[PDB]
């Protein structure tokens, strides 16, 4: 019954998911002056040329664009990672206003939205097993700021009216996720967790420094989605982000400068 309302939002999650107050929870604020450059960090390897998207689903919390992860197709490697991580889905977190929406923050700055490209470590066989491991997932986080339109995001925006409510899905084949990436792959990285229940501490976070720009019309359409199912009172799907959590005993490393 968890969600993003006053009654079941982030401040309530710890009751059903005690790990919400754990030692490596996400998101976090990225203090740019405190993040240390790690010359040993390798360039990130994002290989999405063979990606096979399949479907887009409104799950009542956000919408997921799902991929075929039964083979090494779209994969993330390098950077802070050991091994190969397969892309399984991507989703976003956004706000009701352009001044809020991202989960991670940069020197306390909030972006209008944040894209999460979720990948799982192939050494664990499947996603369900991977989330039970400290190095099971690698999530590539990309900030969205409002300005010029992002062409590669338009196919997603255009299909949203067909998955307006919780439980609705639609075919979403032949979508190229490379169109959602910024020019630079410079990043910050730290050990964290899923940002919605079950809040499992299985994620190596890789957050890109360069945000992508999307238009006001594009994000406006995200805000027309519904948290509710069809035939239920309309609750706009906005502010589906968890605020920054205590960094605790962790160091955020930078791949640049
Ligand atoms: S980020 C991110 N990826 C996730 C996958 C499953 C459940 C929660 C999640 O949060
Ligand atoms: Zn997420």
From Swiss-Prot:
The keyword Cell membrane applies. Changing residue 59 to D: Strongly reduced activity. Its cofactor is Zn(2+); Co(2+). One of its GO terms (cellular component) is cytosol. Keywords: Acetylation, Cell membrane, Cytoplasm, Disease variant, Lyase, Membrane, Metal-binding, Osteopetrosis, Phosphoprotein, Zinc. Changing residue 64 to H: Enhanced proton transfer. One of its GO terms (molecular function) is cyanamide hydratase activity. It catalyses: hydrogencarbonate + H(+) = CO2 + H2O; urea = cyanamide + H2O. Residues 1-256 form the Alpha-carbonic anhydrase domain. It is linked to Osteopetrosis, autosomal recessive 3: A rare genetic disease characterized by abnormally dense bone, due to defective resorption of immature bone. Osteopetrosis occurs in two forms: a severe autosomal recessive form occurring in utero, infancy, or childhood, and a benign autosomal dominant form occurring in adolescence or adulthood. Recessive osteopetrosis commonly manifests in early infancy with macrocephaly, feeding difficulties, evolving blindness and deafness, bone marrow failure, severe anemia, and hepatosplenomegaly. Belongs to the alpha-carbonic anhydrase family. This is Carbonic anhydrase 2. The gene is CA2.
């Amino acid at each position: 019954h968890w969600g993003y309302g006053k009654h079941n939002g982030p401040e309530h999650w710890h009751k059903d998911f005690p790990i919400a107050k754990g030692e490596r929870q996400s998101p976090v604020d990225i203090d740019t002056h405190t993040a240390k450059y790690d010359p040993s960090l390798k360039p990130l390897s994002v290989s999405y040329d063979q990606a096979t998207s399949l479907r887009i689903l409104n799950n009542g919390h956000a919408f997921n664009v799902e991929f075929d992860d039964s083979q090494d197709k779209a994969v993330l490697k390098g950077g802070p990672l050991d091994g190969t991580y397969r892309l399984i889905q991507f989703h976003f977190h956004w706000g009701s206003l352009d001044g809020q929406g991202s989960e991670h923050t940069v020197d306390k700055k909030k972006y209008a939205a944040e894209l999460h490209l979720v990948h799982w470590n192939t050494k664990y066989g499947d996603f369900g097993k991977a989330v039970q491991q400290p190095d099971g997932l690698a999530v590539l986080g990309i900030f969205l700021k409002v300005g010029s339109a992002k062409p590669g995001l338009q196919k997603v925006v255009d299909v949203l009216d067909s998955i307006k409510t919780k439980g609705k899905s639609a075919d979403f084949t032949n979508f190229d996720p490379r169109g959602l990436l910024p020019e630079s792959l410079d990043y910050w990285t730290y050990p964290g967790s899923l940002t919605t229940p079950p809040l499992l501490e299985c994620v190596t976070w890789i957050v890109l420094k360069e945000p992508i720009s999307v238009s006001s019309e594009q994000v406006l359409k995200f805000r027309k989605l519904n948290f509710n199912g069809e035939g239920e009172p309309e609750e706009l799907m906005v502010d589906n982000w968890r605020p920054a959590q205590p960094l605790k005993n962790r160091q955020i490393k930078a791949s640049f400068k």
